[PDB]
Amino acid sequence: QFNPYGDNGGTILGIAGEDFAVLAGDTRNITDYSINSRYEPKVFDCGDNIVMSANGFAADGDALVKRFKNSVKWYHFDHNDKKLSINSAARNIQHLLYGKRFFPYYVHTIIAGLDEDGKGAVYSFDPVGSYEREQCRAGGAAASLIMPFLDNQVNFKNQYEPGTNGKVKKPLKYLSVEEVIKLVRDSFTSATERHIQVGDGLEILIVTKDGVRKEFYELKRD
Amino acid sequence: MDIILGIRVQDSVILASSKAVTRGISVLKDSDDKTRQLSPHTLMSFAGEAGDTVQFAEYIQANIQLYSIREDYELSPQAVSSFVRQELAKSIRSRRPYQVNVLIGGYDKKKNKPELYQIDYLGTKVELPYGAHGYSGFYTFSLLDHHYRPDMTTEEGLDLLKLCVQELEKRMPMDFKGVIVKIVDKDGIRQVDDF
Amino acid sequence: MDIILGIRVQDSVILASSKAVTRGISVLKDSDDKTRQLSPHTLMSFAGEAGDTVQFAEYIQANIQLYSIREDYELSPQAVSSFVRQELAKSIRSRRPYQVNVLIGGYDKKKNKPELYQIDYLGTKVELPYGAHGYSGFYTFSLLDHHYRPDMTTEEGLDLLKLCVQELEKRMPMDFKGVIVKIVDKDGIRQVDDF
Amino acid sequence: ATTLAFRFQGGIIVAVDSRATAGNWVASQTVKKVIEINPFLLGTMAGGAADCQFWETWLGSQCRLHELREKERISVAAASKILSNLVYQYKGAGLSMGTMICGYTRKEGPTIYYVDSDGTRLKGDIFCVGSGQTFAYGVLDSNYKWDLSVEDALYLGKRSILAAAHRDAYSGGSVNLYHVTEDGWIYHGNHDVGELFWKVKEEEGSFNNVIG
Amino acid sequence: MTDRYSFSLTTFSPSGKLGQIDYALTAVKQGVTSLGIKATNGVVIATEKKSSSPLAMSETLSKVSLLTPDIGAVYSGMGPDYRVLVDKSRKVAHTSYKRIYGEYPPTKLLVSEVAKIMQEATQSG
Amino acid sequence: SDPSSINGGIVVAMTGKDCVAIACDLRLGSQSLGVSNKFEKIFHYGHVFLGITGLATDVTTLNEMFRYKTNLYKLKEERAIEPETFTQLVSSSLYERRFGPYFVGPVVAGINSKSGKPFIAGFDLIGCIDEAKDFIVSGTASDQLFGMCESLYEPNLEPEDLFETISQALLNAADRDALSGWGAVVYIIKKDEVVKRYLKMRQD
Amino acid sequence: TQQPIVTGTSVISMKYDNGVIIAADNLGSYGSLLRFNGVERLIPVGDNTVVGISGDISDMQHIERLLKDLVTENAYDNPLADAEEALEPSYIFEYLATVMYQRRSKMNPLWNAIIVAGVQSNGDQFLRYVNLLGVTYSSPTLATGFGAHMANPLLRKVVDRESDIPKTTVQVAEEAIVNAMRVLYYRDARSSRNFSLAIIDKNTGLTFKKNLQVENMKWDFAKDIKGYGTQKI
Amino acid sequence: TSIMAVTFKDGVILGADSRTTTGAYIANRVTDKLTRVHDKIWCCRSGSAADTQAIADIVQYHLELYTSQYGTPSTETAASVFKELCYENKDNLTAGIIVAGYDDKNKGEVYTIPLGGSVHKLPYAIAGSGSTFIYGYCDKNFRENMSKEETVDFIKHSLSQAIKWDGSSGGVIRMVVLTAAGVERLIFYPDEYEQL
Amino acid sequence: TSIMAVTFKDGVILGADSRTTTGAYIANRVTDKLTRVHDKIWCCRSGSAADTQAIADIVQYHLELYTSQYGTPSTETAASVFKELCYENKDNLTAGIIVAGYDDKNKGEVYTIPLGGSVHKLPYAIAGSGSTFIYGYCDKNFRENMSKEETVDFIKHSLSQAIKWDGSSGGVIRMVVLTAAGVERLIFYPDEYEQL
Amino acid sequence: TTIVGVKFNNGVVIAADTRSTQGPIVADKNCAKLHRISPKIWCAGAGTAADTEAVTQLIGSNIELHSLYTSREPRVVSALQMLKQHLFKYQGHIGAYLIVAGVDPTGSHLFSIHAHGSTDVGYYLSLGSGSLAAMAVLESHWKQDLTKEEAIKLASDAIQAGIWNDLGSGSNVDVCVMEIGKDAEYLRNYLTPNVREEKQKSYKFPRGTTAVLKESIVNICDIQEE
Numbered sequence A: 001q002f003n004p005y006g007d008n009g010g011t012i013l014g015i016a017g018e019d020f021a022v023l024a025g026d027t028r029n030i031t032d033y034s035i036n037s038r039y040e041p042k043v044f045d046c047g048d049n050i051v052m053s054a055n056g057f058a059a060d061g062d063a064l065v066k067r068f069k070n071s072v073k074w075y076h077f078d079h080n081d082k083k084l085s086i087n088s089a090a091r092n093i094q095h096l097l098y099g100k101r102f103f104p105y106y107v108h109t110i111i112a113g114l115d116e117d118g119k120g121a122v123y124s125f126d127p128v129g130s131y132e133r134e135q136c137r138a139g140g141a142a143a144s145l146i147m148p149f150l151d152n153q154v155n156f157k158n159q160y161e162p163g164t165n166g167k168v169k170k171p172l173k174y175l176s177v178e179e180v181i182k183l184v185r186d187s188f189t190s191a192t193e194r195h196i197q198v199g200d201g202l203e204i205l206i207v208t209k210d211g212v213r214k215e216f217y218e219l220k221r222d
Numbered sequence B, C: 001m002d003i004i005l006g007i008r009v010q011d012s013v014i015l016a017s018s019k020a021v022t023r024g025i026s027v028l029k030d031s032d033d034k035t036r037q038l039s040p041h042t043l044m045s046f047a048g049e050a051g052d053t054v055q056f057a058e059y060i061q062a063n064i065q066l067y068s069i070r071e072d073y074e075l076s077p078q079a080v081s082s083f084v085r086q087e088l089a090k091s092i093r094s095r096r097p098y099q100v101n102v103l104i105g106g107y108d109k110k111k112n113k114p115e116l117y118q119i120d121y122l123g124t125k126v127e128l129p130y131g132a133h134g135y136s137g138f139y140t141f142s143l144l145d146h147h148y149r150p151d152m153t154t155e156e157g158l159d160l161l162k163l164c165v166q167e168l169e170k171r172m173p174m175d176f177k178g179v180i181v182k183i184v185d186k187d188g189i190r191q192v193d194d195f
Numbered sequence D: 001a002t003t004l005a006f007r008f009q010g011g012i013i014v015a016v017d018s019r020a021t022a023g024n025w026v027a028s029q030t031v032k033k034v035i036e037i038n039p040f041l042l043g044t045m046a047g048g049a050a051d052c053q054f055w056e057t058w059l060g061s062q063c064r065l066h067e068l069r070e071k072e073r074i075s076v077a078a079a080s081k082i083l084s085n086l087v088y089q090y091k092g093a094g095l096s097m098g099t100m101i102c103g104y105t106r107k108e109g110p111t112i113y114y115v116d117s118d119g120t121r122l123k124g125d126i127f128c129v130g131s132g133q134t135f136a137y138g139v140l141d142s143n144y145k146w147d148l149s150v151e152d153a154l155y156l157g158k159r160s161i162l163a164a165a166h167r168d169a170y171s172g173g174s175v176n177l178y179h180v181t182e183d184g185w186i187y188h189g190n191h192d193v194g195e196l197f198w199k200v201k202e203e204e205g206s207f208n209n210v211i212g
Numbered sequence E: 001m002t003d004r005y006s007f008s009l010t011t012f013s014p015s016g017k018l019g020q021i022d023y024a025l026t027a028v029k030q031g032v033t034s035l036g037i038k039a040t041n042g043v044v045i046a047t048e049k050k051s052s053s054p055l056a057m058s059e060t061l062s063k064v065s066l067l068t069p070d071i072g073a074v075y076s077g078m079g080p081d082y083r084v085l086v087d088k089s090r091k092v093a094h095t096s097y098k099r100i101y102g103e104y105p106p107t108k109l110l111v112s113e114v115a116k117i118m119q120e121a122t123q124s125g
Numbered sequence F: 001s002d003p004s005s006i007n008g009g010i011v012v013a014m015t016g017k018d019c020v021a022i023a024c025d026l027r028l029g030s031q032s033l034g035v036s037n038k039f040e041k042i043f044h045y046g047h048v049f050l051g052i053t054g055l056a057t058d059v060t061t062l063n064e065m066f067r068y069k070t071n072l073y074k075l076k077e078e079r080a081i082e083p084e085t086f087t088q089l090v091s092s093s094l095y096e097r098r099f100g101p102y103f104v105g106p107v108v109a110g111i112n113s114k115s116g117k118p119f120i121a122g123f124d125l126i127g128c129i130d131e132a133k134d135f136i137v138s139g140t141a142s143d144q145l146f147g148m149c150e151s152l153y154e155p156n157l158e159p160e161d162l163f164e165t166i167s168q169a170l171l172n173a174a175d176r177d178a179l180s181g182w183g184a185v186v187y188i189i190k191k192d193e194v195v196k197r198y199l200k201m202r203q204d
Numbered sequence G: 001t002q003q004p005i006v007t008g009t010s011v012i013s014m015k016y017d018n019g020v021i022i023a024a025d026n027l028g029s030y031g032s033l034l035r036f037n038g039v040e041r042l043i044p045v046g047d048n049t050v051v052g053i054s055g056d057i058s059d060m061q062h063i064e065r066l067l068k069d070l071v072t073e074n075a076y077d078n079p080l081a082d083a084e085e086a087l088e089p090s091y092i093f094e095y096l097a098t099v100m101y102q103r104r105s106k107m108n109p110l111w112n113a114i115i116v117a118g119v120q121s122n123g124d125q126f127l128r129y130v131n132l133l134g135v136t137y138s139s140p141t142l143a144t145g146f147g148a149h150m151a152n153p154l155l156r157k158v159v160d161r162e163s164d165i166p167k168t169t170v171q172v173a174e175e176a177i178v179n180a181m182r183v184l185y186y187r188d189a190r191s192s193r194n195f196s197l198a199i200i201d202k203n204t205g206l207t208f209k210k211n212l213q214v215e216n217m218k219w220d221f222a223k224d225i226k227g228y229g230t231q232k233i
Numbered sequence H, I: 001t002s003i004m005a006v007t008f009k010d011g012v013i014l015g016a017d018s019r020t021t022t023g024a025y026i027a028n029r030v031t032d033k034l035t036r037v038h039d040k041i042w043c044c045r046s047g048s049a050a051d052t053q054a055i056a057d058i059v060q061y062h063l064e065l066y067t068s069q070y071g072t073p074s075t076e077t078a079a080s081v082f083k084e085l086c087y088e089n090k091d092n093l094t095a096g097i098i099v100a101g102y103d104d105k106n107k108g109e110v111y112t113i114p115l116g117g118s119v120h121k122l123p124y125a126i127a128g129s130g131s132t133f134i135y136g137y138c139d140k141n142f143r144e145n146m147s148k149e150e151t152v153d154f155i156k157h158s159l160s161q162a163i164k165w166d167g168s169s170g171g172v173i174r175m176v177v178l179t180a181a182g183v184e185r186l187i188f189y190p191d192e193y194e195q196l
Numbered sequence J: 001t002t003i004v005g006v007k008f009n010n011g012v013v014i015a016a017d018t019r020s021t022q023g024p025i026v027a028d029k030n031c032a033k034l035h036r037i038s039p040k041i042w043c044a045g046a047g048t049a050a051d052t053e054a055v056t057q058l059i060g061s062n063i064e065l066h067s068l069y070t071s072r073e074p075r076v077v078s079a080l081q082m083l084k085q086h087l088f089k090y091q092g093h094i095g096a097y098l099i100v101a102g103v104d105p106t107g108s109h110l111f112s113i114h115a116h117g118s119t120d121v122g123y124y125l126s127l128g129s130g131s132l133a134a135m136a137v138l139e140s141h142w143k144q145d146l147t148k149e150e151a152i153k154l155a156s157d158a159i160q161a162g163i164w165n166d167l168g169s170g171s172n173v174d175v176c177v178m179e180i181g182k183d184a185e186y187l188r189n190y191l192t193p194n195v196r197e198e199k200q201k202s203y204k205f206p207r208g209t210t211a212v213l214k215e216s217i218v219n220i221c222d223i224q225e226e
């Protein structure tokens, strides 16, 4: 019997800062126990200061990104070159995903950018289009390895102030872009050690008011 | 849903229908009215798959009300039951059939006679002095076979119905949260508010 | 069978067990006592597959009574519960396992303390202030979590138990025909004949 | 998941938890399970997250079109029936939905409709839906009165979700509270279950089984 | 056939003596001398290679046997009985210890196992 | 249906400077229903500590089995069993049920009384020994624990620093698992003192 | 939904400093029966692109006709059909990739794994993969089927990352490809000795080599191997 | 697998390819499928490699113990022992074995034991997945009382074709010659037999 | 079924057995599997008898309409029409067809269309259940540019062996010769070909 | 898992990677896959890890007793025969796939054995999920009359191919060289090409960060005197 779905592995991570947002993902593409590519880009600049990744089944992932990029193009044609805000992009992607409710895009989608007040924004989608604005979200193979670490080190969960013994929580102080990138790199280094589908390379896209910047880092290739 | 009973006496038809609505683990409601007035002298109770029951009942209700307005005339209980049967007989060979069983209790103003019709989801129609759907008949028909008389008063019909419900409450595993009882006679349809 | 509840208060353990026995379509009995006295100060209630429940309970009862005679001594509730757990843990990897869940309510005469043990058919044992098997806990544990105090009197324990049974009678689809309630304390085991 | 809604003297209380799971894995603790259909109508999320989100936003669009055409607020009866008729068209295809459509109008008063993906539409005073529904029902049934104050009703809804959050493995995170009045709904904050549990335990004397 | 001797061949006499054990000790007494001495940093065991014939290659007959890498044995008495006991002692060190704990048994416990085998030949049928 | 995830729960063990730490949650459930918040999963036989996750009936049975065996070991050997030796005993005992196994994830932690060397080990349900230098994880949130440990851990942590590391590893891993939590215990083990600490955590 | 009937095995390929190499054997299998021994599975498109295809041969022949039709269609009302508006490797791939994903979305796939090898207008090397699921990816070395498991490891030792491409000559690359084909012949039970090899170079253009054979094979050591354990004779 | 045994004037010769596959992967390209159960009694194995090795080992044990008690066994006796194991354990075995041997009294003999565990004495036998493709060729080209050189050519040509068409067959062609003169091993490489 | 087509110096010859089975029952022992789609374009059919008849009838219709408009079709054209039907309807067909024809420009040509609906131009082709047993023989004995008599002997001998080993094949050997001289039918009976 | 065996001039070498996995998760990053059956008979295992360990130790135990009984150094063919008959009896349910190598008074030997009980002979062999990557290297560089140094190089290169290209394999290369007339040399972590880079951040917490409910001393000591 023909199985229209596959699993290309990969792991992605989006984090929203105070006036910036990052969307990171490993560059390894796999089927079963083989490596297809050590560098196959997975996070994409979609225009209008929006970055996107659709992780899981790469054929569906490429299709969705392609259709969203196309939606941005036609939004400009139809609405006098108006900038597609991140919230509007998020609602649009819901309809793209739910349009195939009964034959879904087998992906976990994350987009990142800035909201209309200039604050950092990350949106997270399930395969059939349910979505939420979030501060922090890992997706894909090693998502279960990364999220608990982010709960602890980004939101300071279960951390209290010394001397008070559980009475006073550790205050939620804002993180810089340099601080976030450190946590992203350590998240992926740790995931690479314990997950066989994670490795080769890490590509991070950073979004600010100035535009979209890229950073690349090597990961272990075993 | 679960238990729906019907009994045709001398001058009226009495329909009894359980109040419980259960969605798997929990009883979501204990005051549900499993019936629709199709016309002033015709009442239909119903039980079957969730959603389809009410959808079907209201669909029938709308069609009969449409007929009533168009012709300025109330269809006979026999005519209404035939219309309902055909809809279910059509439905059974559809892509997704209505999983609904009904009782139709009506008073024919032309013949001055009460009439009770039993129709299952296949479109199987029978006119009866008393009837039921599901497992209700298994517990109640032996009592009805014994006590029923065609010349019973409405009050005697209600008493025989109480005995049927008592037997159901004793031997049935499910708690159906009592019954709503409605009477259909020459003056129309009314609900017995203490049962 | 269906619902079995247990609550350990200040000076006693109270076990409540349903009275219904249903074989598929009909309720065959409404006065069934789903419990066995293992020793003068130890009571075990049980629920699971038909036949296996009583067979297992009486088998345990016989073994504890044998121990009592041999040593002229009553085993502690803890000791009895451990014996019962091992039997079920042995049973789960047998050719045909005992499909039986139990509650063991006992008063330890050495420590002067009531004790309640919950054991499922796998041999999973836990000591609790209150417990249940099947779906009973889903309806009752929120009430017990709210009202329970370790210093409750027996009368307060019975009142909290009544509230639990009332919630079960409201939201459960099945009619379990009420409960038999038994108290285990320093004076032994007795049945509350009005509940 | 645990969602409830109940009618009372002061209108409707809606209370929900915040947890979403995929198997044993806790996907999110910050899920918004109350869908703000419009400033007067609320819906609850249970079953399929997408199915609830998508079709209850869609419902908001249909309600807006209704009042543009009819120059009058849509009734809770009519709003709930638009949704139930829609999901009934899809019956068999695999939609998963269990929701309470809640509103307060002039002609109806406070009204709650349980709508469900196999076509069920039930009007009622108290509804609970989700994996932790049975736990919440216990607290609701034993403490509910029509003549509850807005303050006490809000607490009752909060306490009932807490009960479910504690016992049900697939419920938790935080509690969202809403109070629906005739002039619209009023949000009554997000309440972390972790902090709420200890606070309630001390103040109320409940959960003596748990060491704090 | 079948071993129909299911009864003890060693029994208490009226004086409380177990005859067959006493007679086994007499056989040991006739055996060639062997000895053992314990030092602070080692143990030594020794015996005479009493060659039955000069044509016999006495190197092929091992009176001193390795049981484990850290345990050795020597005897006095009936050579064939010793040889089979060494076979059983080597095996029991594996079956009742090394295959369980992943290490060789301590001296006292291997001795205990050999002792048990010898006790059973004193009571079994 | 899957026996190893009916009851839920987790265990984690870590090595530090002249010390080991082993920790577990306190939940026992029946799938979605929480049943007990006092189900401890760490046991000890002398100075050797054993954590066990998985099917709760097997957890209890194996504890009783290893208490049985270590008690006989001690009577015969005239000394307490060591972590290295006990690890082999656990492996042997699990593999004897090769085609009808106990549905568990055991974790051994302790310090060798003669060498003073810290020791930890993990097993699959069938006896395969994972003897890691850094950390061992087990249970329904083992993925989460791997993620926490791999980032939070650093070698040669002092006892009171190791406590913070392992506690935060357990807590945040459990809060991303529906079937773990409802309390937690941490053992800090040194050559001749052991401290046991119950942690405050969310009760959902 | 169908099943493949007549099938072709591995297609292997790699980038080198001035272009790309691609290779595939000449066998059309019918299950375990080595049915057809003269099947060309490398199909050139113009003078800048070679499409290598594995899997179902009936679908390969269909794809071959689509590519032939593509060339005809591109020449229509196109004065620069042999110059600036000639078909690029990237155009040919994107077309095929569209078709493959559309067909899988209708639950009626072309049962193939495809590698498009070529050189673009600006001299850039083009090498990308697409299969029956519409899954696409690029890499310095690409291989299908058994080639993915056995050829890639060998080819990745020559070009392990992007920066190794300019350091790799055509002689070294072809040598690696030819060795990989020998290894596949040793170890793939659905392979043949006869194969085709194509080089697409930005300077020397398209070189298409037919009727190549696996040579320099080691078999002599087989004479010393006896029994399966204890047998000496 | 492609295996065969052929009787001729001076005795019998066994032939086999050397390919062992797991699916489409060649797990061993230099396998020895000609196995010795006695000095001048050999067999060709096809089917499960585990099963046919287990069977052959047991037969070798049986014939070794037979020889110690009763002297050299006949080829018929060896075939019978093979049959007993294959027939009685037919539910749990996947084994197709050709037994070939040389007596001085009986000279060259060939027995084939297919899946069911039946025995068939033949002038020559073919078996294995590759044999299907050479039923026509072998039937047309086999003669009785061929010379050694003719028989080697017959087997070489036959297995050449079996290898050519069967993907599960390949590698070298191994042969074992059984005569009064003794036991001779032959090997033929791809460059030799592919050009035939 | 055992079918084949062989090109030779003067053109092409098609060959076939005459057995049609339903399970083990021979439903027709004198079947004609050599079917005419045009004057000098014929085919051999294997697989579902219903499917291959339906396909052949449609092809004959297509080539008749082709001829009325464009004159005599090539053998390649006929093969293409067969392929179009077999490929596009692969999910609902079980058909293995060999197409053979004679042009004056192209002379004798043979095309085989297996299950999938692929096309393969060959010097000769074999198909049907019985073909498996003669891959070895046909490969060893086929030569290009044979005479008519040699080609008849090659096909007769080949199908003889296919019939001998395949239970699904049997009856008479039918042949159709396609040359410039015209169309000649040949038939060979069991008493003739069994003694070969 | 990638395991190989390579024959050379005066002996045999085996090698293996050090990654053990449970699904897509790496359980142990430095696993020991080279198993000692006897001092000069070693084998590498693929498949179910408990099975490869258990079957090695059982046959290793019985080989030791056999060596003591016969007063002879163990032979590879004995280990092979005992392993295959044990695995055959269990009809593949014991999932042990082994490469068995060693030296004995008969000479140097190299065999493979599969879970169902079939064995093979060869000069170079590979097993596991990375066996195809490894065999590609072996088929490209193997020759007759390899030296000790050439064989170690070839074997480790074959493991590396598995490490880099097979997701089931990773971390380090273990080697064991068995030469005739010499002690077998076990080279644990012969190569280490996968050390983790330093992390960007230290995650050491401030003391008192975790909330505690109760503290208590655990009595690990026995019942005390007096």
Ligand SMILES: */C1=C\C(=O)NCC/C=C/[C@H](NC(=O)[C@@H](NC(=O)N[C@H](C(=O)O)C(C)C)C(C)C)C(=O)N[C@H]1C(C)C
Binding pocket: F124, F125, F126, F128, J001, J002, J019, J020, J021, J022, J027, J031, J033, J045, J046, J047, J048, J049, J050, J052, J128, J129, J168
């Ligand atoms: C080499 C990899 C392989 O040859 N095959 C991949 C399958 C991996 C097996 C093995 N892993 C284990 O044995 C793990 N335990 C395990 O799988 N247990 C099974 C289960 O389903 O839980 C039971 C016994 C059926 C263990 C490492 C936790 C493995 O990693 N093999 C390696 C090599 C031999 C170590």
Ligand SMILES: [Mg+2]
Binding pocket: A221, A222, J162, J163, J164, J165, J166, J167, J168, J169, J170
């Ligand atoms: Mg790898």
Ligand SMILES: [Mg+2]
Binding pocket: F174, F175, F176, F177, F178, F179, F180, F181, F182, F204
């Ligand atoms: Mg939790």
Ligand SMILES: [Mg+2]
Binding pocket: D164, D165, D166, D167, D168, D169, D170, D171, D172, F203, F204
């Ligand atoms: Mg919870």
Ligand SMILES: [Mg+2]
Binding pocket: I048, I051, I092, I093, I094
């Ligand atoms: Mg058909």
Ligand SMILES: [Mg+2]
Binding pocket: I163, I164, I165, I166, I167, I168, I169, I170
């Ligand atoms: Mg025939």
